[PDB]
Design a protein around this ligand. Sequence first.
Ligand SMILES: [Zn+2]
Ligand SMILES: [Zn+2]
Ligand SMILES: [Zn+2]
Lengths: 133, 137
Amino acid sequence: QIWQTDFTLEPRMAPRSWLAVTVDTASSAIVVTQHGRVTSVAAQHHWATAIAVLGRPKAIKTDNGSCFTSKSTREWLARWGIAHTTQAMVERANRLLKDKIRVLAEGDGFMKRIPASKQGELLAKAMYALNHF
Amino acid sequence: LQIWQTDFTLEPRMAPRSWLAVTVDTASSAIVVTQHGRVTSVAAQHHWATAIAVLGRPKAIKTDNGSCFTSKSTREWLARWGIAHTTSQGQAMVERANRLLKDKIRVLAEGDGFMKRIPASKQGELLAKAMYALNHF
Ligand SMILES: [Zn+2]
Ligand SMILES: [Zn+2]
Ligand SMILES: [Zn+2]
């Protein structure tokens, strides 16, 4: 598999409002996780989630953000045997995810921040809606 | 399918991220370890996603009653993954891995000249090398 990964902000999911999103380019499958800060660790724990869900890819493509080009991330991706190169599919995935998140939250009456106790199920439901799990 | 045991243990050499979450597969004795700054429900869930990535999905996970294992957020996560969960005794195999791992961490750090805290930029490769050495004796 060849994946594309990027981070995007979703303030309805605050305080853990940074979403890491990966898309598999051949299948269009999408995995998202939420994070309180954009760090190398956050990217690594997101990829371990995506691997657990979809299988281990041959290569991941990203932009040049510092979470993705750090010595830490470069070391992790070599340890896992995944090649790394430094858009349209991930951007499409972001918009579809944000839309689902907005309509589900506003439907439950949450017009601003979603309470932390409701976030885990609401993000899973948004993700499952865009997939064939 | 697989049955795991998981627990957290503190390792001050790996500070500030000195919380180690450890999972042992009961059939194969394989260990997966990740390190975390705080012991929270999310740290356990990201540890387990890592262990699924390395080992494959288990049928069941056994833990103690620490609050990050029995929280609503952890109960919901385990249910979404379809993993059964069983819970003040402890479990032998994970306590033994905790001991092996701390000994191993000490030996490796000390060979590289780190006598007390390991510099944060060294800790990822060293923890991975310790986990690999125990699995590949
Ligand atoms: Zn970006
Ligand atoms: Zn994490
Ligand atoms: Zn414990």
